[PDB]
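User: Predict structure, ligand flavin-adenine dinucleotide.
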Amino acid sequence: DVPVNLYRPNAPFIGKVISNEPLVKEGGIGIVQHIKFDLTGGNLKYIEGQSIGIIPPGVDKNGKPEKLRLYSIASTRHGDDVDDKTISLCVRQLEYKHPESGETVYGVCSTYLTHIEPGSEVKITGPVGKEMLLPDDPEANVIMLATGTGIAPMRTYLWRMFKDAERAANPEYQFKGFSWLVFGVPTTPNILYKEELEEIQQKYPDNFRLTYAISREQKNPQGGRMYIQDRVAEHADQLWQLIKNQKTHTYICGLRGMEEGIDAALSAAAAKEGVTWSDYQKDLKKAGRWHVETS
Ligand SMILES: Cc1cc2nc3c(=O)[nH]c(=O)nc-3n(C[C@H](O)[C@H](O)[C@H](O)COP(=O)(O)OP(=O)(O)OC[C@H]3O[C@@H](n4cnc5c(N)ncnc54)[C@H](O)[C@@H]3O)c2cc1C
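Assistant: Predicted complex:
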């Protein structure tokens, strides 16, 4: 019943950009844009936790057409306007100074996307992925560990769980469990979707907990900059206690090099009860309750 590959690279769906808005506020590091595309005219359907491909125009340095780049869907299946007519992405402009000598490098697809104008036609493929799907059980617990744009799939979950319009549109899913997002970014201006995330926590204090790891504004107990692995270590016992529930699911996105720190913290917590985390975790993965998507 899960939609998959309704459109492929050889015959992509040609969508139209509706809006391209900045998510990084003044004083933040980098550029991250929220881009919404019109899906009318096609049959692209999708669910929370999936991704779509974007095929940028142009050729690479070898003269070959550019290939698709995958992006985690940032909107629920109904789209940001809950009209089942759009899809949104959370795109960071990739930019890095080339080693040994000044000159900055700009990622092809991400720069194309972050600077795209409303009305422009875009080649879209997908949806893709069955690794980050949300359980249908409204009483499940959901732990979300994310950094930067890794917030994308989490937004799809949280919006479906807590937006008034979503709850009205999803009679079959009235979330009543507990969800906890631990979000790591460099600055407060970099907290993507800050206002809406905090709105949700204020409205659902018993169903949603929000924890930040802001590196340029906070220090861990050792004096270093605060990162997501530090927050997990800080709340290791609480997280492990939740993970023990047969209905708890954990989602990780964007922790390229944080996963090891995460496991170290949970391992120490589980060890107190004579449990080897690495083994317990392997079983969670097999059971489909430990979801990971890092790149
Ligand atoms: C499943 C999945 C989901 C994703 N979701 C998102 C998302 O939601 N938001 C998002 O912004 N991106 C996401 N990405 C990443 C995205 O697919 C692209 O890889 C990213 O946007 C950069 O592509 P680009 O075309 O702009 O850069 P490209 O032109 O393809 O260049 C990228 C290349 O530059 C090089 N490079 C990058 N950084 C450095 C560095 N610091 N030092 C030296 N070389 C470097 C590497 O060789 C890398 O392959 C996701 C990826 C996957 C696989």
